[PDB]
Design a binder for this molecule. Structure first.
Ligand SMILES: Nc1ncnc2c1ncn2[C@@H]1O[C@H](COP(=O)(O)O)[C@@H](O)[C@H]1O
Ligand SMILES: Nc1ncnc2c1ncn2[C@@H]1O[C@H](COP(=O)(O)O)[C@@H](O)[C@H]1O
Ligand SMILES: Nc1ncnc2c1ncn2[C@@H]1O[C@H](COP(=O)(O)O)[C@@H](O)[C@H]1O
Ligand SMILES: Nc1ncnc2c1ncn2[C@@H]1O[C@H](COP(=O)(O)O)[C@@H](O)[C@H]1O
Ligand SMILES: [Zn+2]
Ligand SMILES: [Zn+2]
Ligand SMILES: [Zn+2]
Ligand SMILES: [Zn+2]
Ligand SMILES: [Zn+2]
Ligand SMILES: [Zn+2]
Ligand SMILES: [Zn+2]
Ligand SMILES: [Zn+2]
Lengths: 327, 334, 327, 334
């Protein structure tokens, strides 16, 4: 059938930075995370490396994606699918070739898939300020991130959902620890620290006769996986404008809605969340200059030059928005 | 939003739509659009004010609005039926039922408050699927509630739990006695929305309508608690299953939504190879038959018995129901 | 080897109604629940029947036992060990010989060992009056019973404790529903109905040619397991005096402690919980007349005459107490 | 209503004992017996009255006592060390440390309230086993808190959670700013009691001492929140690791209790077939040797540092520690 052919053609660029993820969501009946995750899992022969029954994986993937909110413009299954697919490409970078095991790769991928599951569409601070049960439960510390990990794992325990049923205790335990570490790193309050470490790791870069980086201890191997997935999560600004633009309008819609919510209860309107005093263009350039670029610049210097085009794409989007700035 | 305490010219239109709050058939879907998807917050506020519930229970307005919005925020916008619109619908419907002649001055303000509050939280945080589905899938929700009245227990837990958020305890000024009473009634009412309790509830209601004692004003006479809570439980149960009794234009909107939700479940069940639940197979659909099936075995027996209890008060509602049944009979393709 | 030989001998009375359960508590190292369970399981060959790895089984029993409060005088591991063994003997009752299946038997025994796990030492009403988290979670309905179940299961997910790992998706669903049905039947507010139904069923009792009780549908089969475990839980007044008295003292200590707790908070003091207006004896007689006797009078009916010595001990034990009531 | 928070017929002796509430070395075990096992309720009540916290934060007396009894009720009576007596001890020690001359007028009342409240809940609902044990069994606890500071996150959650039981919200009259400020501090303080953070906590304290500043009055100058909370964290951390600095008669009771708990875990660890944790093997126990090690590598380095920060205020405390160290030294059987 035609509709299926168009989907398959789109899925062909799965290993490409710039996948038409939105197009894919439209064609799979809004199951981008499921299709992309299953596709990426065959391209990596993961189902076979870990003996993952076909039906189990699909059932879990459908369930996980079902626990992403369809009423949320940004933090939904499309964003999940996108970070997953982005990490997938980052993993295949030449400077990291052969560096990670099948388990560590399965970790950064699973982590990415669940990194924002059941996201309410509001920031940690909003959850804290309203005294939400979630905030009370996690003591105001990485409330959302802890909850994401929590739901991600808990969903494994559903009927025919354990995609790690055939792993070994030694493996499940190792996978668990890595996913926790990666996801908790997606919390922006950890950004500044993650970047500092990343830089220090680039000023002690160690390559091999194969030119590929050398990762001795766990602390170094995980630190790359954290920045990797962190990079994927903050990758929309480095994608083809057509994509970046959809992400921006979606993220802003969510901030404005949070702003309305805060303006409903008379709270101070959060930054960038006020639709009556907004600078969408300014904010984007600001977000890139103080966070996105300073981060990706360090990532490029790590896998130099495997990401030269990505950084270049980012600098051009930076200007595209700039040359759109009124006052 | 009002410039100098004076309405906005949309907020005004909302206000005029809300003049039919005491009427069966309120344009709830419009009110939802007009209020910015705040049908639950505005209809609850309207009802609390009219029934003078804020002064009687010393509920500060800010706390009420904040809670309401918080409660409404916890209904799922991505759910076609079990959302804030259905909640607002059930609240306003119970509100109209409470005002019936046959029950005039029968319930105390605390019982009224419980019927309305229970209506507002009755389906909060509904995931869009049934109890059976959560059970067969091994959801944590089902395990927590040991597969018994899973959703109903969860709705209650969430409804009360939300009272604890910043400036959300609308019952802060009720004495412990008032709170323990309110709470038991609200729990008794919401658990009674579970369909598995349907038959027994109806049976006791018929049994009541039989031994039914009345007058002093021609109004119903309720002795003990078992009787009063039983009536209130059926009252909210009737409001929850009242869509088939509303004007056809409303009823069909409700049907599309529940059917959509039923199909989405059928789809999700199928994807997993699970036995497809009744009415859920969007491929072997019999919408027209479903409604007739639903009206003859559940809705009509219920409202007929309810019409008996408060007769003649509910004649028009029973008629509209009987009339909506025929209409669906026609629609049945042969 | 000194107290061990002594413990083995003591277990020779496992299928006997009146086990010196307390000795087994000392001799076993405060593991009455773990040992009685390990023995009973091997006997009914439940380990081989459901392929229960000796490891897991013991590991769950230990996780479960540890989850019984050692500070609580009554509702603890000894009581749970008592109920499991009392239930055991009841299942081996002749009039019921060959009625229940290996799966139903496992339920009954499992339901018993967890029927009171993690009991706080206070009644549901106390938890309800204080707006305890547990009561808010279960809506003031069977608060402790719901909790008992929830911990019974969740504790399976611990480390190598999932005993029912070698059962089918069909078995596990049956057991689960049976365990839940049983445990929730122990809630006293359910007592009246369970008795009325048990009696109504004794009125329409039916057997096969061999005289084996004929339990047709699920309603009947579970209603018998429910009341059975209910009789076990309410069996201390039917045990030899020497036992009954230790139990009565232990529950009164718990009642009084709850009473002191209510007194400190200016709360109304529950019945039997006021050590200043106590009638410990009048209470035992009252308890036996309105509840224990009517329940046991009917169970003896159903298993005529398997339980007669039991019933007789009950009427005798009531007398010993009645003679202690002053005035 | 009663004098010291609870009812007691030995009130006289309890009264004389509580007179030493401002002194290092309080007979906490004796107060625990005289109070009817209510050491935490009585000592907290005494401290709040003494520091005039009820009036300053408009805390109703009945709400304070109700909360205190609830909190105390949630420490396990079957745990030899991490119980309500330890909680009471740590509270009273923090109270003494807050009164040190070098810190006079340095902390606000809200910071004082936070440090004391944090101390009272710091180990609430302790199971009697380490985080490692909870992690190596995949316990629901070790899973809710992604293996990071399991017990500490749980102590905080339960402590704050109990504020929601009937008449237990002792912070009901503080403003939103005060409640948010208090909460963060309490949270920062209790997480810091995790031993896994000791070394880093100690380093930062040394950095502070090395660059120690004093005001016109010989009291510590603490500008930013970071230095403020840091002092408070080390302060409660010191109080938690203060038993080796109390009169030997007290230290020895604490050592017997802590070891009895370590051995309860050692047993359980070999039952489930696990690697016995340090100091938990009751067959190869070097108790005296352990104390010497604990003092040498943890307690002494920590108190010597606190002592420099408040020099010479803690000279006697540091002296008693050293005497207790040498005492166990002479007990070690070679
Ligand atoms: N296009 C964007 N514009 C502005 N902020 C963004 C954008 N993309 C990501 N962010 C920020 O990065 C954060 C990453 O966290 P999360 O959204 O939870 O993955 C978001 O919460 C935003 O605050
Ligand atoms: N229009 C309708 N057609 C068919 N079934 C309905 C309709 N309205 C309600 N129901 C059923 O009645 C239940 C009422 O419970 P709920 O609405 O979920 O509180 C629904 O879950 C459906 O199973
Ligand atoms: N010996 C006894 N004397 C008085 N009441 C008892 C005795 N044994 C059990 N009960 C009651 O029976 C109930 C049975 O439920 P439980 O013991 O909680 O499983 C207890 O909660 C007590 O209230
Ligand atoms: N007397 C003691 N002997 C040995 N270790 C101790 C002693 N007192 C405290 N500790 C250690 O300090 C930790 C403080 O944590 P906690 O007691 O859980 O707040 C304990 O878990 C022990 O590891
Ligand atoms: Zn995120
Ligand atoms: Zn994200
Ligand atoms: Zn419902
Ligand atoms: Zn409903
Ligand atoms: Zn019980
Ligand atoms: Zn029991
Ligand atoms: Zn601690
Ligand atoms: Zn401590």
């Amino acid at each position: 059938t035609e509709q299926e052919d168009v989907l398959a053609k789109e899925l062909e660029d799965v290993n490409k930075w710039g996948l038409h993820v939105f197009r894919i969501a439209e064609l799979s009946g809004n199951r981008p995370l499921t299709v992309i995750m299953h596709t990426i899992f065959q391209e990596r022969d993961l189902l076979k490396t870990f003996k993952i029954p076909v039906d189990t994986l699909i059932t879990y993937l459908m369930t996980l994606e079902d626990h992403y909110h369809a009423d949320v413009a940004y933090h939904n299954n499309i964003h999940a699918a996108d970070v997953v697919q982005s990490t997938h490409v980052l993993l295949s970078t030449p400077a990291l070739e052969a560096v990670f095991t099948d388990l560590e790769i399965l970790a950064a991928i699973f982590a990415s898939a669940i990194h924002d599951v059941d996201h309410p569409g509001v920031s940690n601070q909003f959850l804290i300020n309203t005294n939400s049960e979630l905030a009370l439960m996690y003591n105001d510390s990485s409330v959302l991130e802890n909850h994401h990990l929590a739901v991600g794992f808990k969903l494994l325990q559903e009927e025919n959902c354990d995609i790690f049923q055939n792993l070994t205790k030694k493996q499940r335990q190792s996978l668990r620890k890595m996913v926790i570490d990666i996801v908790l790193a997606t919390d922006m309050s950890k950004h500044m620290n993650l970047l500092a470490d990343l830089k220090t790791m680039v000023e002690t870069k160690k390559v091999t006769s194969s030119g590929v980086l050398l990762l001795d201890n766990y602390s170094d191997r995980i630190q790359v996986l954290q920045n990797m997935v962190h990079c994927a999560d903050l990758s929309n600004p480095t994608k083809p404008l057509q994509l970046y633009r959809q992400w921006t309008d979606r993220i802003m819609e969510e901030f404005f809605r949070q702003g309305d919510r805060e303006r409903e209860r008379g709270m101070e309107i959060s930054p960038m969340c006020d639709k009556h005093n907004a600078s969408v263009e300014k904010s984007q350039v600001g977000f890139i200059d103080y966070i996105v670029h300073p981060l990706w610049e360090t990532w490029a210097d790590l896998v130099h030059p495997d990401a030269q085009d990505i950084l270049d794409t980012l600098e051009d989007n930076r200007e595209w928005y700039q040359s759109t700035i009124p006052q």
